[PDB]
Amino acid sequence: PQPKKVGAIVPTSSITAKKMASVINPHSGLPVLELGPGTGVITKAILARGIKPESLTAIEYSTDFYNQLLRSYPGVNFVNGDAFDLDATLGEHKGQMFDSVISAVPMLNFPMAARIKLLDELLKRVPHGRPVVQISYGPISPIVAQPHLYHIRHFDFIVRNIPPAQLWTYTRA
């Protein structure tokens, strides 16, 4: 018989969210950047690390999701806009450094070239050696290797996610 809710249209599992947020160092004194907070399941896991709400910036394109997030997570710095346009959402880069970037934007909705460019820009805004972590569902990295720009590491696999979730980390080369 025919299954409903095909693909990834239900919120990410709390087990997946906890592993994504485990890359954070809550003692670095640097804020955290979240992309695509949606219903807030990863937001919650980030705050559970002890990140002050004002030190979490989260960029959400959906205005409906954004309005609900403001009411559900007081004090978090939510931004309503496009994560691929960091100049418009974060401002032109003038020195702000994030501890790490936690990304659940649906990479496969965008051309490969845009994904590469976004990753190269995010890695400018974290200290050399700190990570971007990204969730995806295929067997390979949602962003193809460019070894002169970044290094790709497989981070974890969560079979109880619907559908099963791959986590990848990226650091500057």
Ligand X SMILES: CSC[C@H]1O[C@@H](n2cnc3c(N)ncnc32)[C@H](O)[C@@H]1O
Residue ranges in contact with ligand X by CB under 6 A: 36, 38, 59-62, 65, 82-84, 104-106
Write the CA distances from 48 to 59, 68, 153, 171, integer angstroms: 19, 19, 25, 24
Nearer to ligand X, 9 or 29 (CB): 9
CB of 80 to ligand X, least distance (A): 9
Smallest distance, ligand X to C-beta of residue 27, A: 27
Would you say 31 or 151 has its CB closer to ligand X? 31
Six token digits for residue 3: 């299954």
Local structure of residue 12 (DSSP, 8 states):
P
CB of 170 to ligand X, least distance (A): 17
The residue number whose beta carbon is nearest to ligand X equals 36
For 57, the 3-state DSSP assignment is strand
**Cβ closer to ligand X: 11 or 151?**
11
Residues at the binding site for S-adenosyl-L-homocysteine are: 12, 60, 82-83
Angle at 30 between CA 75 and CA 120, to 5 degrees: 105
Rounded to 5 degrees, what are φ and ψ at 118?
-60, -45
- Write the DSSP symbol of residue 92: S
